[PDB]
């Protein structure tokens, strides 16, 4: 059996004569988030293309970040992990992983007869 790009994705075993598929084992690159070797020596590894089922474990859309706590607040983006997530060292001290905030929530007092 083949696929769009001529790669064997199915096969029939000679003895039992049953249909089996083939799926490549999980791959992916490794990226490390560091706050600079002048402040601290901690890091946070992030497998890019694998879920956490495989090898403080937050599963993200961009991969499976390991070694960084997850917070609820929202700050500016220091280290752009991806898909709206950013990581920073400033929380005794630990690396956090939050969601990026675009800015303050403002609202002008618009009306039909007021000017500033």
């Amino acid at each position: 059996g083949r696929d769009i790009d001529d790669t064997t994705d199915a096969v029939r075993d000679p003895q039992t004569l049953e249909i089996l598929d083939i799926t490549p084992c999980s791959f992916g690159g490794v990226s490390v988030i560091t706050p600079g070797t002048n402040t601290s020596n901690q890091v946070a590894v992030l497998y890019q293309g694998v879920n956490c089922t495989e090898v403080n474990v937050f599963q993200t859309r961009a991969g499976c970040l390991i070694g960084a706590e997850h917070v609820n607040n929202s700050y500016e983006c220091d280290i752009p992990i991806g898909a709206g997530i950013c990581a920073s060292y400033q929380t005794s001290q630990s690396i956090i992983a939050y969601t990026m905030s675009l800015g303050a929530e403002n609202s002008v007092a618009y009306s039909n007869n007021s000017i500033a």
Binding site: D5, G84, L102, G103, V108, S111, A116
Partner: protein, 404 residues
């Protein structure tokens, strides 16, 4: 001289960024083999340069998007009271029912384009929801403040007065707006309706990019079933049929072919990324000059005299809806450069001298509204034997009747 006007809204499509892609140099060439990798080490560092170039392009895409869209300090919000003097920004402003918080036209645009062996695809730093949030902030700031929010703190102002000051910057006076507010509101609403009706029946600028980025990958993948002169285009087949003394004259041909394929791909991607970067710079300039202000440059923000623009977000691109002002119906008149009243020559201050056949009036250039020629519309300069086409009508002098 025109007697009537129309408001026209036109769209403009611009690509901003393309899909990020990182291609492994070792897994693409070899795979899981080890003899292939040991042979590949003899070529030096041709697997670090390619990865560095691809990472550079990947970072540049996010920089493009960030510099185009992130131009507002604070996320402004539209007030609930939608009394804008008749103008209806309902298909432009977001609808807080869909989970994506996207307006009608942004949905029409997002449903028009859409419908490992080394290669991966990385996710964008700014997800589509955040881009919609940015465009909504820009729209709410433009509507409720004008150009003030792009040049410091935001100052409120009623929309009708803002449009009056937008007319006053293209020559037409503001009583023209205030005395024809309903007609202008109706024309603007009709124009928005036509835009939404024409976006549902295109977007070739944003598709000729996806097509090229897809055929490049298709060619790269298809360049893996070529023999390149060896006996078979499978490393796991060669390694299972030849002893190591006599397989490194075959794997070497495979290595040469696959390296040349990767080099061609990387060069083409570098050139394409440069082109996209130029377009993103143009898009950022258009945003800064047409949205956060009113532009006097001709044919930059649309076709006609620019009034204002609104941004919308499209997949891997941006959409501008330029609002302009075009004169409609003209009429023939007769003109004189100056008037010789009493040995003096009266030139118009801001306007032009026209006559319908019997009497002479003074009127503004971009609209027709005649006025009597007083001494508050004209100024004197010399005698009337130098000007070439001077006529000899009379003026009003509005102080004489009151001095009785």
């Amino acid at each position: 001289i025109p007697i009537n006007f129309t408001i026209s809204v036109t769209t403009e499509i611009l690509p901003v960024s393309m899909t990020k892609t990182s291609v492994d140099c070792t897994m693409y060439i070899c795979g899981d083999s080890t003899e292939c990798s040991n042979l590949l080490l003899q070529y030096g560092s041709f697997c670090t340069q390619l990865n560095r170039a691809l990472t550079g392009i990947a970072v540049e895409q996010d920089k493009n998007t960030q510099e185009v869209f992130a131009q507002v300090k604070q996320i402004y919000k539209t007030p609930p009271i939608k009394d804008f003097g008749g103008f209806n920004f309902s298909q432009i402003l977001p609808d807080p029912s869909k989970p994506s918080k996207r307006s009608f036209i942004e949905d029409l645009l997002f449903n028009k384009v859409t419908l490992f062996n080394g290669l991966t695809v990385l996710p964008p730093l700014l997800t589509d929801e955040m881009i919609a949030q940015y465009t909504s902030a820009l729209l709410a700031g433009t509507i409720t403040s004008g150009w003030t929010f792009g040049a410091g703190a935001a100052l409120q102002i009623p929309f009708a007065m803002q449009m009056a000051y937008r007319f006053n910057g293209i020559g037409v006076t503001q009583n023209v707006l205030y005395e024809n507010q309903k007609l202008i509101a109706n024309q603007f609403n009709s124009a928005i309706g036509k835009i939404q009706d024409s976006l549902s029946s295109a977007l070739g600028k944003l598709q000729d990019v996806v097509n090229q980025n897809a055929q490049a990958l298709n060619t790269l993948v298809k360049q893996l079933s070529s023999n390149f002169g060896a006996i078979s285009s499978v490393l796991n087949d060669i390694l299972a049929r030849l002893d190591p003394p006599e397989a490194e004259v075959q794997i070497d041909r495979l290595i040469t072919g696959r390296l040349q394929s990767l080099q061609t791909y990387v060069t083409q991607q570098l050139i394409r990324a440069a082109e996209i970067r130029a377009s993103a710079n143009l898009a950022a300039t258009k945003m800064s000059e047409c949205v956060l202000g009113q532009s006097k440059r001709v044919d930059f923000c649309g076709k006609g005299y620019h009034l204002m623009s609104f941004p919308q977000s499209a997949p891997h691109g941006v959409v501008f809806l330029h609002v302009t002002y075009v004169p409609a119906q003209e009429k023939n008149f007769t003109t004189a450069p100056a008037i010789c009243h009493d040995g003096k020559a009266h030139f118009p201050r801001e306007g032009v001298f026209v006559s319908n056949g019997t009497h002479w009036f003074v009127t503004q250039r971009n609209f027709y509204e005649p006025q009597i020629i007083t001494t508050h519309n004209t100024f004197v300069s010399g005698n009337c034997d130098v000007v070439i086409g001077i006529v000899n009508n009379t003026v009003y002098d509005p102080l004489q009747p009151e001095l009785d």
